[PDB]
Amino acid sequence: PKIFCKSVSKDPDFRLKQIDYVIPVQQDRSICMNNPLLDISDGFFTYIHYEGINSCKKSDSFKVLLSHGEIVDRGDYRPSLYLLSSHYHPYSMQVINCVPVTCNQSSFVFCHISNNTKTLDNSDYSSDEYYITYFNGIDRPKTKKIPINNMTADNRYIHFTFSGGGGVCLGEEFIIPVTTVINTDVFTHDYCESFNCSVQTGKSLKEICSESLRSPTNSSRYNLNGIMIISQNNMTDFKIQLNGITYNKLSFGSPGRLSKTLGQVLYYQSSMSWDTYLKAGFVEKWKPFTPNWMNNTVISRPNQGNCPRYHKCPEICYGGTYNDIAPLDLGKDMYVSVILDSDQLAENPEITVFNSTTILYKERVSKDELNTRSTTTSCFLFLDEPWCISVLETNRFNGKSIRPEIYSYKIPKYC
């Protein structure tokens, strides 16, 4: 591990610079550019975002943009983004959800496409379509249909969607964050049942914990997170597994991501239910999919209602924001995330560097009030130094000209 600040610090120097030249700007200021996604691997990057007219829901978005590019040194003494390719998704009006993964210097985008916007409530996954869209700097995009009919599930799932901030490529196989649906309650919650806490009167703990994985719209359905493994040869042969996440510390199905970092694979899952502290950990066993969950007493997220920041006590509730994280040093157990410092409101991004116990240092991204929802953060070694790029889903000018922002910053060498 190289030399950078691994302990508490006041007023640090992140060398924060914003990158405004990668994401398109739109002539129409009624268009809303939302739910940005970025996955950076091997010096190349894949960015994805959803533009839709007068609404920032992903389902409503009427075209969704895919772009591939490269990390390149300008003599600038900092890493910079170079944009190689931009296309719009063929089926974008029918896109429910997408996840990026950057592999062997090319961009892939895995997608869940449906004629029905509510398809995760009424329908089942044989009624919808699943695609890989992949391209590069020189060549033209090619979007293949994934043969879900030959797929081996580790349980009986009636539906699934690609959901999250990025996938991974290990060898000849892809691994993508998915959220899945099953209509019968097959799940065991020990961790949740462990809590001695105030509860809704007239309802048991085991009852509450079990009623918590149920979808907020169709109460007859359980959303449980998982992964999809696609083995492929030249996009002709396919072998597709759908595995669920380990039952150890379950939480209501939410978007989350996989990333290769420091020779590990880190899993993150947005905390959208009663447990509001950071849910993440490295993957210690693939079958079943088993992240070793961090016990993190400090990093949290806002939500309105009965499950706001720093709330860790069972209840059935839904909401919160995705602010994902990336590992700095294993040895000191350190991570960065652009997290929202608010209790309920979604706002005030702060680059925060923390360990499992305490926050090492932080810096607010904007001095003025700033509206932010999703935050993805990726890190890499540049000129033998730790450097980060974060994409923030932002509403900067009061509801018009919505557009995500990109920042790059360096982890301080001196405390």
Binding site: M272, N306, G399
Partner: protein
């Protein structure tokens, strides 16, 4: 930039007018607080589930069709609250956007009792007409 008067949610609250309900004209970038008061001495606790509904559902007083449930006051002993900033980009599960010149509706179909916490049809909406309408950016 103003913090509006916190709106207590109880059968006991007068700010709710029988015909109109509770109306306010908030400006974008304004905070507002909705509270579930805890059981006061000599009074019974009131249990509720506050939904977000379209106008058609506010007139009919039915929350059955689509469920955006904000707060549910199922704890009598600790008061829980709900904070609203009128920007877009709330951390809401169903997604919630606050835009200029739009009308927004919050209301409950619950009994006011533990047994009737989950009632989707009618409820306090009909009787005391406990509901909140928000016309953002109107005078």
């Amino acid at each position: 930039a103003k913090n509006l008067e916190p709106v207590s949610w109880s059968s006991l609250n007068p700010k709710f007018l029988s015909g109109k309900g509770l109306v306010i004209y908030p400006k974008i970038g304004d905070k507002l607080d909705i509270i579930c008061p805890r059981a006061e001495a000599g009074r019974p606790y009131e249990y509720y589930k506050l939904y977000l509904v379209r106008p058609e559902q506010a007139a009919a007083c039915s929350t059955v069709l689509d469920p955006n449930v904000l707060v549910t006051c199922n704890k009598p002993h600790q008061e829980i609250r709900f904070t609203i900033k009128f920007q877009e980009f709330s951390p809401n599960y169903m997604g919630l956007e606050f835009k200029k010149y739009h009308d927004y509706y919050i209301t409950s179909t619950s009994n006011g009792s533990l047994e009737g916490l989950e009632n989707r049809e009618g409820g306090v909406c009909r009787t005391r007409t406990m509901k909140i309408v928000m016309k953002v950016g109107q005078d």
